[PDB]
Amino acid sequence: KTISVIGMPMDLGQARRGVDMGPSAIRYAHLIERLSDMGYTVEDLGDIPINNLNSVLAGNEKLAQKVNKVIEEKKFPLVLGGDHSIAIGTLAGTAKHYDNLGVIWYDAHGDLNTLETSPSGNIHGMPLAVSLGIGHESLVNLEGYAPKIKPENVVIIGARSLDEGERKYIKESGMKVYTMHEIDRLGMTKVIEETLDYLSACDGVHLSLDLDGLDPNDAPGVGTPVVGGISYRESHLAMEMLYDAGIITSAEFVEVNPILDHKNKTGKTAVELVESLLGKKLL
Ligand SMILES: [Mn+2]
Ligand SMILES: [Mn+2]
């Protein structure tokens, strides 16, 4: 598989400055050369330019176009970007190519909000509710079809800041979510194995990884850290098991904010996880 990297320096889905530099902070940390050293022929398609609502719309519209074309040549889009609102454009570009796309949402949050239920209106807390598809029309109907995905095809892994209307929708919708409780109880191995089997009926699986899914001690450079998260090791285990399964057909790594990071510790971790996702082995 030929890795197509697509930078999305999007910060307009959130109020904190700096997450638009995530792509550069990951590129630095040697994403390309590490993937080339692994045997992949990787093409870096650069960053999508950005100039709330409309700029979120236009930018995601352009992101969806590139991801769509990438999959058209059957290459594997690796987005990497700014705030999680870019998943709207990413999933809009991949879902149409799969009769039954699965989604692994690696995140401390559910991002299942809506501008009415949102206490901030920050769209990086809506991309999964959008896309499912409940939310602002122009957002839900991105790329002219909706919903992009089915709640029964989503598995959230890492939830620990999910209060209020999000929880109600989870149980009413039938999403499978592994909160920190299930990870602590069953261990990450079982969680992934149950995730794989659960998603075994999908034509493809998109990995949407929010770096704040990891504990802030391991991923401090995020805009909305939440204590008691997934460890660096557990995260590598999950990536390694996902690779061995061969189910992941697209991936995005979001919310890296160098302005809140410690010497690009979070950007480095992001590259390290991509390596494991794309087949890097200790032995
Ligand atoms: Mn998120
Ligand atoms: Mn999050």
Swiss-Prot record:
Q: What happens when the gene is disrupted?
A: Cells lacking this gene do not grow on arginine as a sole nitrogen source, but do grow on ornithine or ammonium chloride.
Enumerate the catalysed reactions.
L-arginine + H2O = urea + L-ornithine
Q: Mind telling me which InterPro entries this protein's record contains?
A: Arginase (IPR014033), Ureohydrolase (IPR006035), Ureohydrolase_dom_sf (IPR023696), Ureohydrolase_Mn_BS (IPR020855)
As recorded in UniProt, its EC number(s) are 3.5.3.1
Q: Which domain of life is it from?
A: Bacteria
Q: Which GO terms describe its biological process?
A: arginine catabolic process to ornithine; arginine metabolic process; urea cycle
Q: Where does substrate bind?
A: 109-113, 120-122, 163, 224, 255
Per UniProt, where does Mn(2+) 2 bind? Answer: 107, 109, 210, 212
Q: Does the keyword Metal-binding apply?
A: yes
Identify the PANTHER family for this entry.
ARGINASE
Q: What is this protein called?
A: Arginase
